[PDB]
Amino acid sequence: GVTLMVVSQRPSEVSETIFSQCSNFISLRLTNAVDQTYVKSLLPDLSAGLGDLLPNLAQGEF
Amino acid sequence: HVNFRFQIDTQPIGTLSEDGEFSRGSHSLPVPTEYAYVTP
Numbered sequence A: 001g002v003t004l005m006v007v008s009q010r011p012s013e014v015s016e017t018i019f020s021q022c023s024n025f026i027s028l029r030l031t032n033a034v035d036q037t038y039v040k041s042l043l044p045d046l047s048a049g050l051g052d053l054l055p056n057l058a059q060g061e062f
Numbered sequence B: 001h002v003n004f005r006f007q008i009d010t011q012p013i014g015t016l017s018e019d020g021e022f023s024r025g026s027h028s029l030p031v032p033t034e035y036a037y038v039t040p
Helices: A016-020 A033-042 A048-052
Strands: B014-016 B023-024
Touching: A033 A048
Parallel strands: none
Antiparallel strands: B014 B023
């Protein structure tokens, strides 16, 4: 009966196990490359374009 | 040099309106045959 909600800003240096059990993802703006790599890997349905969209989002979008 | 050819690559950052703001992030796309300018 209890659920989590994790928030971070540098997801590379975060536990591999706490994400993988997350069933939904909200991605706002991310710039640092290594972070793009990691968040692209973990997240399945992400080809090159869905990654080319992260670093150009506006303020308030997601 | 073959006349000459000069190339400049670029990566977009922002969108500057006419009123004079600076909204980060550019969801637009420029079309060819269109002009460029230097930063005053």
